[PDB]
Structure formats: structure tokens, C-alpha cells
Design a protein around this ligand. Structure first.
Ligand SMILES: CCCCCCCCCC(=O)SCCNC(=O)CCNC(=O)[C@H](O)C(C)(C)COP(=O)(O)OP(=O)(O)OC[C@H]1O[C@@H](n2cnc3c(N)ncnc32)[C@H](O)[C@@H]1OP(=O)(O)O
Ligand code: NA
Length: 319
């Protein structure tokens, strides 16, 4: 196998060329790839909060060097790419794209396999930084979420947003209680925390929001003193002023976002993104969508009335 035959066998488009070129140049990792198998796999994937229908598919499809030569070449070199700049927030590492699914379930779950392969390196990095065992495990559960969201959106197996799993398994995302933080750098090169609200964890009550937000600064000072971020950033449908037209006075979103300062910048279209995060939308007719919560009602009514949603970018300066 080489880059050209791997492209051909895995049905990859021409736009995969530069990533494959990078992988070919890296070659196999200095530490051989070991994927868990059988019940070791079941146990780990449960701990990672992967849902049951997927667990069995992922376990059954586990690739090997002789059974899946092209995918194995790819997994090996993709994994290598992640350990090579492990924990280094000054280098951009795009993982691969989502692979073509016609090649089978191993391709469909490729990023799960890259994730599992890279866990020992990730954990070695966490230990050198003295990351507590609990925060490593809570952070790693993003893998369950990625898988769950894919099946929820498409009704079939996969990983949602593999660039996020890639960043997390490179030691650059930490979940602290309800919230996730990534060690980023802004346009001007100054350190910043990217703040993300994952889906798993329930409603954003103020107590769980502030308990996380207060822990961020000293956590990253204790474990990543080199980084030095003082602000946090995020861009979201959640920061659209129009939500105040619809949501009730005691809304956690309306209350908690008052702590954020909105950046003024060119309009950012938010119909796709709100439909994504409110419905995990997949092109169905609007009248077919669930209409239980006041937000579900609001999103649909607003859109049906010929009006639009926006994303906004915001910042905090941290407590
Ligand atoms: C808020 C301050 C922080 C703002 C900074 C954000 C910038 C950071 C960048 C990001 O993190 S972008 C990714 C954001 N993540 C997501 O959107 C994940 C999916 N969203 C959710 O899980 C919820 O929207 C969330 C937990 C974040 C908030 O839910 P809450 O229920 O705590 O919100 P709230 O109290 O304001 O909701 C009021 C009404 O809207 C409903 N609602 C809110 N989110 C909903 C949702 N996602 N789907 C269906 N309904 C939702 C909620 O049920 C309720 O209706 P009812 O009283 O009729 O029940
Ligand atoms: Na490199």
C-alpha cells in the first residue's frame, strides 16, 4: 500500500491528496497500533459512553493489518500524525475527513479506531501534566457523544465532527464539569480558551455553569502554565439577541449569556446551526419536526414566518 492505492481502494476524492501525502511521509508510528478486541473493546467503549447498537458494530468491524490493508495503512499513519504533535496547541492538526461509507463499517467508524489507537499516548500526555484521572475519563466521553449524535442525525453509524475528537485526543480539550475548554490561539497569536457546551449533561442550570467556569483558570494554570489564557471565546446560535423574543424570563440561556460580551462583526447566518443544535436536522419538512419545548416551537415558527436566525461571536474575561 501507498498513498495512491489507498486513495483508490477507500474511494477517496482528489481533495484527500494532501492529507494522504502527509500520512505517507510520516510512515508507521514508533509504537505499534493496538486496537482492543472482543470484550475488552465492549468494556472500553461503554466507559466511553458509546451507545449499545454502535458498540456491537464497532467491535465486529475492528480492522486488522491483513484483513483491511488499505484502512490499516491509513489508521497507522493517522494515529502517527496525532502522537507527533500531541498536546501542542501551536500546530494546526486537521485529522482526516469523514471517509466514504461504501467501503464498509470500518471506514464509517474510522475515527473511533484512530481514537482508541491513540488513547495510550493521550493518557501518557495527561499523566505528564498531572491531569486527574476523573477529568481524563469525563473528557474522553466525548467519543460516545460523537457517535450518538451521528446516529441521532442520520439514523446510521458514524462520528459527528471528527475534527473535535481529533483536537480532544491530541490533549487540547478538557471537560470540567458541564463545560469543555480547548487551548486555542486567537488571530493575533494571544492564548485563548475556546468554550463549548456539549449536549450530554442536561440543562445548563446556573450552578453547574458557574462551578465549571470558576474552575477553568486555575485548572489551566495548574496543568498548562505555558498557555496563559485570560479570556474565553465562542460563536453560537445561543448568543443571537432574537432568542429574547421567544424564550421565557427564567431561561438559563438568557440569564447566563449576559456575562458574555458580543463582538460586532459581519452577519453570520444561523438557520443551519440552530436547526442542527435544536433538532439535529436532516432536511425533513419543517412541519414534521418535534414541537414540545418553547424553543422548538420558536425555531419553526420563526423560520415558517420567513424570518432568520443568526450566530454571534462572543468573549468572556475569566473569573
Ligand atoms: C448561555 C451562556 C453561554 C453562551 C456562550 C456560548 C458560546 C460557546 C460556544 C458553544 O458552546 S456552541 C455549542 C452550544 N451547544 C449546544 O447548543 C448543545 C445543545 N444545546 C443544549 O443542550 C441546550 O440548548 C443547553 C443545555 C445548552 C441549554 O438548555 P437549557 O434547557 O438549560 O436552556 P434554557 O433554560 O434557556 O431553555 C429554555 C427553553 O428552551 C428549551 N431548549 C433549550 N435548548 C433546547 C434544545 N437544545 N432543544 C430543544 N429545546 C431546548 C428548553 O427546553 C426550554 O423550553 P421549555 O421551558 O418549554 O421546556
Ligand atoms: Na507536523
Amino acid at each position: 500500500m501507498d498513498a495512491e492505492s489507498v486513495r483508490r481502494q477507500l474511494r477517496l476524492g482528489e481533495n484527500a491528496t494532501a492529507w494522504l501525502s502527509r500520512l505517507e511521509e510520516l510512515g508507521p508510528p514508533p509504537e505499534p497500533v493496538r486496537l482492543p478486541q472482543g470484550d475488552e473493546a465492549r468494556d472500553l467503549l461503554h466507559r466511553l459512553e458509546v451507545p449499545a447498537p454502535d458498540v456491537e458494530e464497532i467491535v465486529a468491524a475492528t480492522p486488522g493489518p491483513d484483513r483491511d490493508p488499505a484502512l490499516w495503512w491509513l489508521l497507522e499513519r493517522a494515529h502517527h500524525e496525532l502522537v507527533r504533535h500531541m498536546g501542542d496547541y501551536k500546530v494546526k492538526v486537521r485529522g482526516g475527513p469523514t471517509l466514504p461509507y461504501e467501503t464498509g463499517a470500518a471506514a464509517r467508524y474510522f475515527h473511533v479506531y484512530v481514537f482508541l489507537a491513540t488513547l495510550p499516548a493521550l493518557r501518557r500526555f495527561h499523566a505528564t501534566r498531572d491531569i486527574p484521572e476523573a477529568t481524563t475519563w469525563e473528557t474522553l466521553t466525548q467519543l460516545g457523544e460523537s457517535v450518538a449524535i451521528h446516529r441521532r442525525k442520520y439514523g446510521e453509524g458514524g462520528t459527528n465532527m471528527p475534527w473535535w475528537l481529533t483536537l480532544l485526543v491530541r490533549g487540547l480539550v478538557y471537560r470540567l464539569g458541564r463545560l469543555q475548554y480547548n487551548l486555542a490561539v486567537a488571530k493575533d497569536g494571544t492564548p485563548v480558551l475556546g468554550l463549548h457546551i456539549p449536549e450530554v449533561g442536561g440543562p445548563l442550570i446556573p450552578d453547574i455553569y458557574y462551578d465549571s467556569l470558576r474552575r477553568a483558570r486555575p485548572f489551566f494554570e495548574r496543568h498548562f502554565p505555558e498557555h496563559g489564557a485570560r479570556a474565553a471565546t465562542g460563536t453560537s446560535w445561543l448568543l443571537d439577541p432574537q432568542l429574547a423574543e421567544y424564550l421565557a424570563e427564567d431561561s438559563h440561556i438568557l440569564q447566563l449569556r449576559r456575562g458574555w460580551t458580543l463582538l460586532d462583526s459581519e452577519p453570520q447566518d444561523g438557520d443551519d446551526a440552530i436547526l442542527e443544535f435544536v433538532f439535529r436536522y436532516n432536511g425533513q419538512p419543517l412541519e414534521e419536526l418535534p414541537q414540545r419545548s418553547t424553543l422548538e416551537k420558536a425555531v419553526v415558527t420563526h423560520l415558517l414566518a420567513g424570518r432568520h436566525w443568526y450566530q454571534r461571536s462572543g468573549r468572556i474575561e475569566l473569573p
